[PDB]
């Protein structure tokens, strides 16, 4: 009966349909390189579907006391993001032939970003919630820096069509990811200005764009073929 349920339902639908479509297209292709991108990219909305569905059915929500009140916090989001965000990075890394060490560092930073975001989301001392938020944001900015400078440098050694597809996906990633810390800061987890129903709408748009939108761009490109 929670007012945000409608956006959880729509999120479930869009992630489910995205997953099914990517699976149908992916199962059809024979190229080994393209199959790898399909496998990674189909798994992303599949995981998001399972977590959206879990939240829709009333799981992954806990009450956290801070600022003198009991606050509803969706922790299931972090279980989704812990796996889906590095998978998205791996898609980008494979496109540009990024170094193994660069991948390890980016994925490591991503784990820090999600883990500290979750710790912040669960923290009972109000001021300290924002310390964890700041650490998580710093880790995110490391990732965006590496994507923008490092991965782009690697992309420039690829065929222009691969570099071009990478730049579109890079741009989508920078724009969408950079919004998440702001939604958290102003929403249910942070300042409590934006109500949970609207916050859930915002994360749904961001999530669907970052997974299904991203995947549509990637999987329709010739860049994924060996």
Ligand X SMILES: CCCCCCCCCCCCCCCC
> Residues 6 or more apart from 136 whose CB is under 8 A from it?
112, 113, 114, 116, 117, 120, 181
Least separation, in Å, of the C-beta of 157 and ligand RET?
26
Query: Phi/psi at 57 (nearest 5 deg)?
Result: -85, 10
Query: How many C-beta atoms lie closer than 10 Å to residue 161's C-beta?
Result: 12
How many amino acids of this chain bind ligand X (CB under 6 A)? 5
Q: What is the DSSP letter of 222?
A: G
Binds 135: which of ligand CCCCCCCCC, ligand X, ligand CPS, none (CB < 5-8 Å by kind): ligand CCCCCCCCC
Radius of gyration of the chain (CA): 18
Both tokens of 37, joined, read 């991108």
Binds 174: which of ligand RET, ligand X, ligand CCCCCCCCC, none (CB < 5-8 Å by kind): ligand X
Contact 135, 143 (CB under 8 A): no
79 lies in the site for ligand D10, by CB under 6 A: no
Choices 70-78, 132-140, 161-169, 209-217 (CB under 6 A): range interacting with ligand CCCCCCCCCCCC:
132-140
Phi-psi region of 68 (alpha: psi -120 to 50; beta: other; left: phi over 0): left
Least separation, in Å, of the C-beta of 162 and ligand X?
20
* Cα gap 167→198, rounded to integer Å: 30
188 lies in the site for ligand D10, by CB under 6 A: no
> Residues 6 or more apart from 98 whose CB is under 8 A from it?
92, 106, 150, 151, 154
Both tokens of 40, joined, read 């990674």
Both tokens of 33, joined, read 């390189």
Contact 32, 226 (CB under 8 A): yes
The residue among 155 and 183 lying less far from ligand D10, judged by its C-beta, is: 183
Touching ligand D10, residues 105-134 (CB under 6 A)? 131
Least separation, in Å, of the C-beta of 88 and ligand RET?
6
- Of the residues 29, 64, 79, 134, which one makes contact with ligand CCCCCCCCCCCC according to CB under 6 A: 134
Interacting residues with ligand CCCCCCCCC (CB under 6 A): 112, 128, 131, 135
Interacting residues with ligand RET (CB under 6 A): 81, 84-85, 88, 113-114, 117, 133, 136-137, 140, 177, 180-181, 184, 207, 210-211
Interacting residues with ligand CCCCCCCCCCCC (CB under 6 A): 9-10, 13, 19, 23, 39, 42-43, 46, 104-105, 108-109, 112, 134-135, 138-139, 142, 193-195, 198
């Amino acid at each position: 009966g929670r007012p945000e349920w409608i956006w959880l339902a729509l999120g479930t639908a869009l992630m489910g349909l995205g997953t099914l479509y990517f699976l149908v297209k992916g199962m059809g292709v024979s190229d080994p390189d393209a199959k790898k991108f399909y496998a990674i990219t189909t798994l992303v909305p599949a995981i998001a579907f399972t977590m959206y569905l879990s939240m829709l059915l009333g799981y992954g929500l806990t009450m956290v006391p801070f600022g003198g009140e009991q606050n509803p916090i969706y922790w299931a989001r972090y279980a989704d993001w812990l796996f889906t965000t590095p998978l998205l990075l791996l898609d980008l890394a494979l496109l540009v032939d990024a170094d193994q060490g660069t991948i390890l560092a980016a994925v490591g930073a991503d784990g820090i970003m999600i883990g500290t975001g979750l710790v912040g989301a669960l923290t009972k001392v109000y001021s300290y919630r924002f310390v964890w938020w700041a650490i998580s944001t710093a880790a995110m900015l490391y990732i965006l820096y590496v994507l923008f400078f490092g991965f782009t440098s690697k992309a420039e050694s690829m065929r222009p069509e691969v570099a071009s597809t990478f730049k579109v996906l890079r741009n989508v990633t920078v724009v969408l990811w950079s919004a998440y810390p702001v939604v958290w800061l102003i929403g249910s987890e942070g300042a409590g200005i934006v109500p949970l129903n609207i916050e859930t709408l915002l994360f749904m748009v961001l999530d669907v764009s970052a997974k299904v939108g991203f995947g549509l761009i990637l999987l329709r490109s010739r860049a994924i073929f060996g």
